[PDB]
């Protein structure tokens, strides 16, 4: 009886992320998962950081620092209730998605954001507590990235270069550094030349490894 | 007589951020360039991309896709307000500099959310005309990044791993991308070890690289 949460970033509904989502949590389910969700759109989620994200009396309100403001905040329980409301989903979660378009080669703001105001030190990391010593070393996270791109253009021989160490300030930067066991990007590529049965099987293989998501060997970091 | 673009994204004035700002306004001014800033907490600029980006009647509303619309909303000219006039100061502009903390490995929310936003077809790029046939191919941009660590930590043998494939999404992917000739980044490191004497040697050098940063060799991408 394991638990998940997955993270959306995209507006529209009617969006092959969303479908993405959709098909994620629907096979989760099917495998006796508790899914939760954060579709950051739908929650309306407020993606900049600022000193409204503490409640209460600053330490110093002069000279305002987001690090050691927002650090203390988390240690005092002096947080906004939105990013409270989804450190909560983290603490319970083994397995996080993180399901978005890729744009300009990297989250969208809305999901960036998502990490700056969410994940506050102490909680997410310690200067002396990072990457194999992360606090979420006993979770896992796994980016389902779609693309306008093809495969080939992000490569070595492509325009864009490889997709690999485009996601590494991600994968390493973001999830690694965290304690998160990162799995394997599920990448579906070149989105608007796929015709609509091929869409039908990227959803149904999609699927089909979340079944055993959880078996899977996650990313080498050295 | 050049003219510069200054993109700031820091919400404090008290900042090291606004402060390098201010010196690079100044040593501008001082050179005779004309100076247009973009501080976008200021500004309190929106950076969520949504179909409120665009006015009046949409293309299809009920299956509604960002980049189809958008493209045609720039071309059309129905883009909503506060992108038409940060495409503005960008189209004015022979120098864009853009002035943020490293957050999480790259730029802070507010400020991927401006090229989202900003960034439109046709105007930052098109599908026939990128890299060195890109649109901005008669401009410049610089990052002045600063940062909590330090810049060993930030090389092969740091943990962090180099800098270069770290700036490469933003200077390549978006900067190059759109056509601008990226000059070197101007890196400044360990912040909160840096005593007050030595900051005021930060603004003053980096100050006297504007001064002929024009002349500058901007960077080679393959
Ligand atoms: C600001 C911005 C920056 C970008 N930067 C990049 C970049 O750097 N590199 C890059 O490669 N691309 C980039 N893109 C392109 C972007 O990655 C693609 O547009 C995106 O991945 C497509 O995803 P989508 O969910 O919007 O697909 P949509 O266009 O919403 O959907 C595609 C198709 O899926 C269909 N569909 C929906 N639901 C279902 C269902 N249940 N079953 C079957 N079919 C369904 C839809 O009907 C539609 O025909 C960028 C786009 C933007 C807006
Ligand atoms: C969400 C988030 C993510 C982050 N991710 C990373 C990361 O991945 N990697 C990393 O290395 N770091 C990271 N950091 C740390 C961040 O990069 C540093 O905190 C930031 O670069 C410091 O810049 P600042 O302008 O806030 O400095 P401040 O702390 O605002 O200023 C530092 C000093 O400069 C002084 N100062 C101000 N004005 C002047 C002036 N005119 N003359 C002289 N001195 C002046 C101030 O008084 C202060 O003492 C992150 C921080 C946050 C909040
Ligand atoms: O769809 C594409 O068509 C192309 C045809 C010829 C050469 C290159 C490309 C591309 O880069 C991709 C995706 C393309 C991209 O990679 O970068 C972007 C940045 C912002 C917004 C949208 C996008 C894209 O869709
Ligand atoms: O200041 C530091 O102290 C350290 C001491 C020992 C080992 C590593 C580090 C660091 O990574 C940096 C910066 C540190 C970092 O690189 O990643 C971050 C991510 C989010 C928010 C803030 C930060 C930081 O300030």
Redesign the interface.
Known sequence: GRRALIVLAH??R?SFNYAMKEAAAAALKKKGWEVVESDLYAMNFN?????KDITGKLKDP??????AESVLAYKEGHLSPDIVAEQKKLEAADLVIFQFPL????????L??W??RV?IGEFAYTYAA??DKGPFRSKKAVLSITT?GSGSMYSLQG???DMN??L??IQ???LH?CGFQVLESQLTYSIGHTPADARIQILEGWKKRLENIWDETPLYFA
């Not at 993606?47 to 000193?51: L, V």
């Not at 002069?62 to 690090?67: D, I, M, S, W």
């Not at 744009?103 to 809305?110: D, E, H, K, T, Y």
Request: proline share 10%; glycine share 12%.
């Open positions: 507006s529209e009617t993606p900049i950081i600022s000193r002069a000279n305002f620092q987001y690090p744009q300009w080669f990297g989250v969208p703001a809305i960036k954001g990490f700056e994940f990072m990457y306008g325009i864009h270069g160490v485009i590494w300030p390493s930067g973001i550094f």
